[PDB]
């Protein structure tokens, strides 16, 4: 028997699951602006325009669409960035004060949703009282009993940052993420991967594609499309405790609008601290809305419904109307220009197997689906238009305690950034690269002593 | 003479004193107490279940317990860690309003008082009731027995954040990389001079310190007999710390069931104060296992004589002063009770010690940011044990050997923490060095 | 050619201009001086000279990112020190003011009554405090009542008086991988190569100058006063004069007594001037007239040399705002103003009368003042003049013998340059190739 020795050159394809940290890689454009979220990409590292991607060949690797860390860390990073953004902004405890509100005025040349509200409020000098005057939405206020239906701040009970800061808030842009040296990103690729178990078309990745951590409630916007057919995924689609996400293979046209308006009156309350007032509507007063053809909705929903019927055993289960929820859940929201739209999705949901969804706008929101503190979106001068970005749908499910299995209502949910972002992020996995140049074989070291 | 070269290759571990930083580690789990910042508040690492130790056959080492400065670093960190946990949480400055009260349904320690506060909407002022302790208020003339907050005109007015209990967690240290712990591992070592069973220690022991005064509770015990140590008891300028070889049970209860009421401090704030009492209103006390205590007194008395020449009668009661030096105390679940310890030592050589609660305290016995300790409903039990005490001679004694009176003392928490560090040093290791050896010179050209 | 093979030898220097972060360093040992605030790195017990015998290096007095870094640090330190301290707005509320009566001059000192709403919710108590001539805003529709100047859109107060500052000679220096080089080149023109360049392990300590016109208590020039500018023909630039010999200043207190405060809350107090002992009009600065005049004679001569003629360099009045008219100074942390146009009058022992202003505009971009707490006891100040900053502009010439140079000013950055003008921080870098005829003794 030949006698042995140990060692090979390292770089042998041996790896372990990584701890999770995300190395921010910028688009090399972020440095040219004056707004938040993009500023976090300014304070980031621009990467290589042509990243290395290498197929592992005869290898499978385990990917899990509903598991582990990567999105959770993004969740926390975004919250921390959000808080850093708002920490410098004013809280205005006195903003809670009840105002006398009447309907919004216009020229004489829908209901009273927007009102002209006013109050006598103590200003930066403690012995001076100024007249407050601003426009407010019913959705942001609470009427007072036995007081001429006057109104108080709706979020007054909680911690409120009464400023998003008009020179700060902005929509997030895509960020590429890199593994730290010693780590690598693997991606499944694999057209139509089921979401669990071994992936057969896996490659090594020198940083992810840019992933945009943008906000919408329930409906996925500004992401990526399925390669051929809609992709319907759940950890267990027959487990009613789980909910199913659907990726579109075709984008859906979106045309959302919000009418032209002004901003005005920085009203000082404190020593260099003020409320920034909603200005007048310019021209006619109308609600926000979205215009989408039913052709696109039906073509995708039909494919989805047929696939669900097949996934569940050729059942007669269909896409159907929502059960409701909190107003922020019933309506499907999005952020354009910093404005928050809440659209009435029942236009699409009140169906079984030029559509215009009225949309509400609201100034006081929590970030995402987080709880505790609240903040508001300052008024935006000009008009807002949002378009052509539906890339995925809404998480859907049902329950049921009926004896019959003939019917089922797949109703919407989601808006949780971990689940929303995970639906695309999961393609990637991060592993630790161990340079284990180790292996026994035959022969001896050329030793003199 | 042969040609020499003086050198030692890296790996002969010369010891230098360590000057800074400890590695915090614990028997970590996804505990609600980490979530709630109960003691350790953040980066304390899950520890090594099997720390190593190396006994060095030829090593003995000079040790001085009062030089265990790593204790100062730990005390400063617990202050900073809790200071961070308490910000911007529960600011109670706006609540200094007057209170009007005479009684509650012993003396009127706790009274049911009325007051108004504004906040939580600037359009309104609201009157309410809550219970207050005499220990935390100052009387005001001519208004139905009015009171102001005792902290009203001083420092910072705050509260412990209500989700946070303060149960000591036995977090230990393993020192940072490049450092090790050197432990004495022997018996009857006096805290000074060399100790002899010296070993390399990876990690030592978790500690569970509490806010206390005269009393050291839930610490470690002595191996055979009560152990009395002081840097130098020659002077009355030094303090004597006594470790027991047996613990003595501590048994206090609320002893009644209270409720909690809200304080509407402001938008988004934590809102809690002391509420109503369910059942009879009863006086707190601890039921102390006096028989065991008395055996410890006999041993303490003996050690206070053995170390003191031919002196005979030793030890007596305290000289008085503020509760922080006079009464023993325990922050039971964050409830800062002070108990009248007199029955434990009203002499020279079952116990039930009445207790009172101070709700606004400086938990570090300094800083000044005294915080209110709100209750949680219902009655509680404070199950703990005595592991040691603080004593010192007054030096105001007469000139005979017949008596030497030591009285209950007190000190910084870090002074009691040194009792753990008593057995070990943190060492910095620098393995590269020199030594002459016959050595061949390399000649290139 | 020969086998001129590539090798890489380094261990001999090369360097680049540094863009790094420098640290506070001093004879570090409670800090009640903001310039250190709470902590500072111990100093270098053995600075070395170390001369680059055959090397010159290109320096530029007006291009130094480290002076800019010092600014970022002074601002940070001002804020860090008072950031956790008390900010007060009840003080915005007006006061009833009257002239102060002293023991037996305009209404320069006033006794004002303020309505105090602090301590307890149902009480408001009027009380007296003293204020100086550099008062706040008078009320247009009332009789000698005043509102706070520093209110409006700001809150300004000595949030925590225990800590303040007096300039301390704190130095600073480079992190690992960096070094500081200095000019030992006498009478350097401020631009281009320095003949004699040597090392700086760390810099000389610097005592910040927070005011205009004069540079006090700094370093001196050797032999002669030195006048320098980025551009001496560009009137937009300020010319700085370093003195070779200093001029003595000794300032005297208006009184010797106390201060009062308003209880705002449990750890919150506001200070105003208390009882007065002495004739308050007496505050003054005693400056040697002869030395100032001789100092100017030397300055005038150097200026004449710089124009090439027997010029007149006239001290026409400048500023238009006391903060930029007077070299005010923070003696004891409180700002004193005197008469800079008395010391240097319309020419080319002097005793200046002095006044106190507690609300003084900071160099910070926010445009806010710092509030100086009143000082109990008495004010005694001494320093020597070590430099002068001058300005000339407007086109008011028409003669080769006529110029108008009068006290000017610039930033704290420009005042700090007095020391930084002598050195540059550079990055230590490895070198490239040391090629030669050799070949490696390869087995392969």
């Amino acid at each position, epitope marked *: 028997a030949e006698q042995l020795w140990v060692t090979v050159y390292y770089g042998v394809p041996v790896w372990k699951e990584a701890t999770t940290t995300l190395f921010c890689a910028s688009d090399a454009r972020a440095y040219d602006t004056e707004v938040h979220n993009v500023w976090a990409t300014h304070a980031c590292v621009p990467t290589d325009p042509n990243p290395q991607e290498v197929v592992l060949e005869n290898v499978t690797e385990n990917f899990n669409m509903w598991k582990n860390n990567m999105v959770e860390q993004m969740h926390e990073d975004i919250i921390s960035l959000w808080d850093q953004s708002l920490k410098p902004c004013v809280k205005l405890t006195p903003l809670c004060v009840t105002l006398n509100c009447t309907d919004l005025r216009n020229a004489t040349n829908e209901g009273g949703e927007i009102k002209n509200c006013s109050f006598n409020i103590t200003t930066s000098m403690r012995d001076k009282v100024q007249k407050e005057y601003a426009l407010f939405y019913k959705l942001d206020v609470v009427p007072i009993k036995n007081d001429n239906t006057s109104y108080r701040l709706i979020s007054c009970n909680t911690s409120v940052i009464t400023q998003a800061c008009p020179k700060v808030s902005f929509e997030p842009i895509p960020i590429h993420y890199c593994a730290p040296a010693g780590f690598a990103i693997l991606k499944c690729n694999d057209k139509k991967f089921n979401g669990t178990g071994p992936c057969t078309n896996v490659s090594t990745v020198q940083c992810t594609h840019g992933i945009r951590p943008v906000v919408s409630t329930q409906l996925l916007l500004n992401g990526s499309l399925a390669e051929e057919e809609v992709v319907i995924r759940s950890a267990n689609f027959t487990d009613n405790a789980k909910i199913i996400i659907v990726q579109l293979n075709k984008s859906v046209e979106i045309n959302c609008t919000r009418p032209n308006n002004n901003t005005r009156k920085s009203i000082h309350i404190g020593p260099g601290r003020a409320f920034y007032t909603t200005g007048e509507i310019i021209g006619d007063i109308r609600q926000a809305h979205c215009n989408i053809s039913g052709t696109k909705w039906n073509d995708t929903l039909k494919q989805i419904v047929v696939k669900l019927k097949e996934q569940f055993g050729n059942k007669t289960i269909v896409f159907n109307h929502s059960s409701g929820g909190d107003p922020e859940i019933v309506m499907h929201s999005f952020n354009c220009g910093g404005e928050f739209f809440y659209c009435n999705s029942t236009q699409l949901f009140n169906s079984t197997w030029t559509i215009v969804l009225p949309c509400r706008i609201k100034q006081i929101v929590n970030m995402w689906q987080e709880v505790g503190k609240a903040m508001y979106a300052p008024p935006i001068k000009g008009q807002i238009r949002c378009s052509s970005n539906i890339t995925g749908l809404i998480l859907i499910r049902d329950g049921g305690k009926n004896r019959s299995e003939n019917t089922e209502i797949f109703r919407p949910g989601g808006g949780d950034m971990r689940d929303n972002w995970r639906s695309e992020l999961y393609k990637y996995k991060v592993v630790k690269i161990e340079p284990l140049g180790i292996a026994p074989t035959k022969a001896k070291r050329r030793v003199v002593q | 003479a042969e040609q020499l070269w003086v050198t030692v290759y890296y790996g002969v571990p010369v010891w230098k004193e360590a000057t800074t930083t400890l590695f915090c580690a614990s028997d970590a789990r996804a505990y609600d107490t980490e979530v709630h910042n109960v003691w350790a508040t953040h980066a304390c690492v899950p520890t090594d279940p099997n720390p190593q130790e190396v006994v060095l056959e030829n090593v003995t080492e000079n040790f001085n317990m009062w030089k265990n400065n790593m204790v100062e670093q730990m005390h400063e960190d617990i202050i900073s860690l809790w200071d961070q946990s308490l910000k911007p949480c529960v600011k109670l400055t706006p609540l200094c309003v007057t209170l009007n009260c005479t009684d509650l349904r012993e003396g009127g320690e706790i009274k049911n008082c009325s007051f108004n506060i*504004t906040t939580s909407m*600037r359009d309104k002022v609201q009157k309410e009731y809550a219970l207050f302790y005499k220990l935390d208020v100052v009387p005001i003339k001519n208004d139905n027995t009015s009171y102001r907050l005792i902290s009203c005109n001083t420092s910072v007015i705050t509260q412990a954040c209500p989700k946070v209990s303060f149960e000591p967690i036995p977090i230990h240290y393993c020192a940072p990389a490049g450092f090790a712990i050197l432990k004495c591992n022997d018996k009857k070592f006096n805290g000074t001079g060399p100790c002899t069973n010296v070993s390399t220690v990876q990690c030592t022991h978790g500690i569970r310190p509490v806010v206390s005064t005269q009393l050291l509770l839930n610490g470690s015990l002595a191996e055979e007999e009560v152990v009395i140590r002081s840097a130098n008891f020659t002077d009355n300028a030094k303090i004597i710390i006594v470790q027991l070889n047996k613990s003595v049970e501590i048994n206090c209860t609320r002893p009644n069931n209270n409720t909690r009421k809200s304080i509407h401090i402001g938008p988004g704030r934590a809102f809690y104060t002391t509420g109503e009492i369910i059942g009879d209103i009863r006086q707190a006390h601890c039921n102390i296992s006096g028989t065991k205590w008395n055996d410890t007194l006999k041993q303490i008395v003996v050690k206070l004589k053995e170390q003191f020449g031919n002196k005979t009668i030793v030890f007596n009661h305290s000289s008085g002063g503020d509760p922080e030096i006079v009464m023993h105390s325990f922050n039971c679940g964050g409830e800062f009770f002070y108990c009248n310890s007199t029955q434990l030592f009203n002499s020279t050589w079952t116990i039930v010690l009445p207790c009172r609660i101070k709700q606004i305290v400086n938990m570090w016995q300094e800083v000044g940011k005294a915080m209110y300790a709100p209750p949680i409903k219902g009655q509680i039990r404070c199950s703990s044990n005595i592991t040691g005490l603080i004593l010192i001679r007054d030096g105001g004694k007469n000139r005979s050997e017949n008596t030497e009176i030591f009285r209950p003392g007190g000190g910084d928490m870090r002074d009691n923490w040194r009792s753990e560090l008593y057995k070990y040093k943190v060492v910095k290791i620098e393995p590269l060095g020199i030594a002459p050896t016959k050595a061949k010179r390399r000649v290139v050209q | 050619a020969e086998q001129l093979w590539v090798t890489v030898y380094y261990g001999v220097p090369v360097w680049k201009e540094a863009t790094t972060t420098l640290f506070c360093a001093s004879d570090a040992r409670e800090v009640h001086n903001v310039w250190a605030t709470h902590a500072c790195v111990p100093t270098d017990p053995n600075p070395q000279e170390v001369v680059l015998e055959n090397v010159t290096e290109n320096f530029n007095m007006w291009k130094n990112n480290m002076v800019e870094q010092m600014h970022e640090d002074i601002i940070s330190l001002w804020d860090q020190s008072l950031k956790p301290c008390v900010k007060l707005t009840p003080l915005c509320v007006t006061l009833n003011c009257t002239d102060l009566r002293n023991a037996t001059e305009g209404g320069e000192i006033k006794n004002c009554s303020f309505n105090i709403t602090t301590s307890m919710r149902d009480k408001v108590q009027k009380e007296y405090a003293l204020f100086y001539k550099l008062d706040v805003v008078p009320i247009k529709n009332d009789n000698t009542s005043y509102r706070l100047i520093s209110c409006n859109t700001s809150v300004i107060t000595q949030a925590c008086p225990k800590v303040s500052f007096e300039p301390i000679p704190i130095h600073y220096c480079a992190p690992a991988g960096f070094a500081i080089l200095k000019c030992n080149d006498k009478k350097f023109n401020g631009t281009g190569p320095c003949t004699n360049v040597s090392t700086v392990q760390c810099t000389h300590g610097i005592r910040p100058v927070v005011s205009t016109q004069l540079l006090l208590n700094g370093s001196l020039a050797e032999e002669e006063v030195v006048i320098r500018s980025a551009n001496f023909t560009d009137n937009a630039k300020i010319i700085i004069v370093q003195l070779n010999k200093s001029v003595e200043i000794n300032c005297t207190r208006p009184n010797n007594n106390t201060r009062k405060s308003i209880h705002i809350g449990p750890g919150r107090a506001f200070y105003t001037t208390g009882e007065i002992i002495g004739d308050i009009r007496q505050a003054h600065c005693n400056i040697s007239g002869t030395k100032w005049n001789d100092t100017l004679k030397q300055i005038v001569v150097k200026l004449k040399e710089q124009f090439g003629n027997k010029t007149i360099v006239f001290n026409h009045s400048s500023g238009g705002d006391p903060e930029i008219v007077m070299h005010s100074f923070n003696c004891g942390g409180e700002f004193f103003y005197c008469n800079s146009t008395q010391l240097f009058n319309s020419t080319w022992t002097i005793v200046l009368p002095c006044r106190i202003k507690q609300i003084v505009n900071m160099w910070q971009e926010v445009g806010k003042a710092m509030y100086a707490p009143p000082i109990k006891g008495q004010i005694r100040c001494s320093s020597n003049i070590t430099g002068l900053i001058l300005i000339r502009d407007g086109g008011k010439n028409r003669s080769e013998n006529t110029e108008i140079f009068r006290p000017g000013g610039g930033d704290m950055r420009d005042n700090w340059r007095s020391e930084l003008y002598k050195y540059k921080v550079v990055k230590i870098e490895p070198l490239g190739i040391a090629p030669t005829k050799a070949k490696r003794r390869v087995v392969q």
Partner: antibody
Amino acid sequence: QVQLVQSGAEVKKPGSSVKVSCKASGNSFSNHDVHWVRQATGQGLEWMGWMSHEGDKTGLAQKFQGRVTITRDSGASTVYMELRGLTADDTAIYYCLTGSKHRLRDYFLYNEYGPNYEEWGDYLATLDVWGHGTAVTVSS
Amino acid sequence: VVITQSPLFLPVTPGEAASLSCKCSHSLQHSTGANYLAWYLQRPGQTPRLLIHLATHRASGVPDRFSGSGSGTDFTLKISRVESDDVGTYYCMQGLHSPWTFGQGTKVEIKR
């Protein structure tokens, strides 16, 4: 129109007393202030003192300070003016206020936690036409 | 503050205007704005009647014979077309922040 009720005319001996009961029909007084005067024959009016329906009260004319005490029946919405030490010079027809006062304030001051240091209680809002009023005289 | 009403007696030709005045030797205004103006009339056989003239406010029933204005230390009331119906004593009301009392009383009569 509210019927304004007052005690009927009376004559008292010097140094004596009378009580004037001013009931507002319909109990309108519960929403109105009361302020009371004297009009001697051939003379103008003077107030003796004031009370709100809210219970805020003070004398006004510094000559009745110990001569007139004003109270009320909050159930019957009736105000009682008790006059003491009546003399010949007190012969007059007495009248109660109609109309109202508002709690006017014109000094605003709040601290950071919002305590109210406002100065208020000025300004009559409306004027007082009363009904007949009642004569009180003194004789012997 | 005090109040007087010069000339305190105005016999008139019926149909002639009256000019009544108030002097208080105190500067009066609502502290919050305009001066407080009020007046009342007590005709023989009557309880007071109101003639408020509070810039824009008059008691219901006041005819256009009556109008007035003022501020500071004084004010006036003009009565156009004075008739026998207007005979009585005219009282000028004080301001409302000292606090307030009543007028002096000016008699207006038709000349015999």
